[PDB]
Amino acid sequence: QYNNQNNFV
Amino acid sequence: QYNNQNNFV
Amino acid sequence: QYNNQNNFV
Amino acid sequence: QYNNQNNFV
Amino acid sequence: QYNNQNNFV
Amino acid sequence: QYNNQNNFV
Amino acid sequence: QYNNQNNFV
Amino acid sequence: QYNNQNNFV
Amino acid sequence: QYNNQNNFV
Amino acid sequence: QYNNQNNFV
């Protein structure tokens, strides 16, 4: 299981 | 299972 | 299962 | 199962 | 099953 | 099974 | 199974 | 199974 | 299984 | 299993 999340402001 | 989410403001 | 979502503002 | 959604503003 | 949806504003 | 979709704005 | 999707803005 | 998705803004 | 996703802003 | 994701701002 590969879980990825990223936020760029 | 591959789970991906990204936000670009 | 491949799950993908991305938001570009 | 391939699930894809993207939003471009 | 291939599920695709995209929005371009 | 070959599944292909592309969007060009 | 080959699954491909690309978006070009 | 080959799963590919790319976004170009 | 080959899983690939890339975002270019 | 090969899992790859990259973001370029």
Side-chain angles (χ1 to χ4, degrees):
Chain A
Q1 202 185 59
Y2 181 99
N3 301 305
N4 185 49
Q5 201 281 325
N6 304 268
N7 294 310
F8 301 86
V9 188
Chain B
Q1 202 185 59
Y2 181 99
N3 301 305
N4 185 49
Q5 201 281 325
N6 304 268
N7 294 310
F8 301 86
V9 188
Chain C
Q1 202 185 59
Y2 181 99
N3 301 305
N4 185 49
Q5 201 281 325
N6 304 268
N7 294 310
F8 301 86
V9 188
Chain D
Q1 202 185 59
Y2 181 99
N3 301 305
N4 185 49
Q5 201 281 325
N6 304 268
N7 294 310
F8 301 86
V9 188
Chain E
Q1 202 185 59
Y2 181 99
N3 301 305
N4 185 49
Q5 201 281 325
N6 304 268
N7 294 310
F8 301 86
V9 188
Chain F
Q1 202 185 59
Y2 181 99
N3 301 305
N4 185 49
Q5 201 281 325
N6 304 268
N7 294 310
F8 301 86
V9 188
Chain G
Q1 202 185 59
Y2 181 99
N3 301 305
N4 185 49
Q5 201 281 325
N6 304 268
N7 294 310
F8 301 86
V9 188
Chain H
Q1 202 185 59
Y2 181 99
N3 301 305
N4 185 49
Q5 201 281 325
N6 304 268
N7 294 310
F8 301 86
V9 188
Chain I
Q1 202 185 59
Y2 181 99
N3 301 305
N4 185 49
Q5 201 281 325
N6 304 268
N7 294 310
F8 301 86
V9 188
Chain J
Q1 202 185 59
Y2 181 99
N3 301 305
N4 185 49
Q5 201 281 325
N6 304 268
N7 294 310
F8 301 86
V9 188

